[PDB]
């Protein structure tokens, strides 16, 4: 997350931290995700497409630090890793960048709600907030595009939804942005998601309720002028989410 502020998991209690285990070596952070029901985390396919092997991923909920424990956190294995069959990224855009992780603890349990662990509501079908409204993003991604290091503490910032008409201008992204995506950025291009934030949530108030409007997907650099963050538009994937979580 470029700009914004350090936060606690209490303020983003749906946030899932996803790591990869390397047999014979290290554990590395991969991506964020969002708890949509006790047993299901939603993330981005491009986080996993190169190595779609459920056994080597680890999911935490209630976790606000990258390399230490948070009181009340839960650690999960991935019982099922579901990627979108029409994911592609032959050009700049990532299409259908959405994934599901069924989570199961060592003792065989799903997530247990608390002050630090909570589901986030899905939007109603095709229901998005209006352009020019504020949304929150969160993650353990880079603080500057060219950093080698990552923040130790979870961050969040606020970005604004940008119209497709604006985002599809040639000097923005042209036809790379589709109606299955949403653009969001800072009016002054000072804050954005960045590498390490994919899979995490774009959270907007909708029908009285914090709602998973988007999933962090892609962009040209991070916080660059006329290059918004691009987010999977969740309200266009409800049937996919419903049929794969059954």
């Amino acid at each position, epitope marked *: 997350i470029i700009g914004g502020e350090f936060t606690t998991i209490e303020n983003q209690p749906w946030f899932a931290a996803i790591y990869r285990r390397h*047999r014979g*070596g290290s554990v590395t952070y991969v991506c964020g995700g969002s708890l949509i029901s006790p047993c299901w985390v939603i993330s981005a396919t491009h986080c996993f497409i190169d190595y779609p092997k459920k056994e080597d991923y680890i999911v935490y909920l209630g976790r606000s630090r990258l390399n230490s424990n948070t009181q009340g956190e839960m650690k999960f294995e991935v019982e099922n890793l579901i990627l979108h069959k029409d994911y592609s990224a032959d050009t700049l855009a990532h299409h259908n960048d959405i994934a599901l992780l069924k989570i199961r603890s060592k003792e065989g349990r799903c997530a247990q709600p608390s002050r630090t662990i909570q589901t986030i509501a899905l939007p109603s079908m095709y229901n998005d907030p209006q352009f020019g409204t504020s949304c929150e993003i969160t993650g*353990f991604g880079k603080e500057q595009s060219t950093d080698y290091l990552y923040p130790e503490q979870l961050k969040m910032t606020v970005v604004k939804l940008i119209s497709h008409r604006e985002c599809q201008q040639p000097h923005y992204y042209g036809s790379e942005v589709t109606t299955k995506m949403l653009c969001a950025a800072d009016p002054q291009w000072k804050t954005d998601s960045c590498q390490g934030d994919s899979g995490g949530p774009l959270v907007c108030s909708l029908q009285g309720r914090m709602t998973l409007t988007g999933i962090v997907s892609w*962009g*040209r650099g991070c916080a660059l002028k006329d290059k918004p963050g691009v987010y999977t538009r969740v309200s266009h994937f409800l049937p996919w989410i419903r049929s794969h979580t059954k």
Partner: nanobody
Amino acid sequence: QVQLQESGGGLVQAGGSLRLSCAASGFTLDSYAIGWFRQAPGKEREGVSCISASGGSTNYADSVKGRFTISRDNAKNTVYLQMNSLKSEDTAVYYCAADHPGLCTSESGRRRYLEVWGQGTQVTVSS
């Protein structure tokens, strides 16, 4: 503790062959896109070759295409650069790199990338 380490460099005669190795530790390079770069005296760094995460495709810079081959051995957790028909202009420090945006992989995805570099191996081709 992810790292890469190059080996195999040295002095070779023009027209000859050389194989460089890039050995990973702390991770397995089998599911990451890997590449080789080089930097010759007084010149900027140049991409040489890369292999995709799946291993289904490889790419070559104009200056080495048709002469160099990149490959990956998952049993040895090592990537190779086979350099045939060497020329004096191939004299450089060679570096391998794993999981960087744009290196045989997307440059727009916002997942975390390892962005690992090796330390270099010197290749000198005498004509």
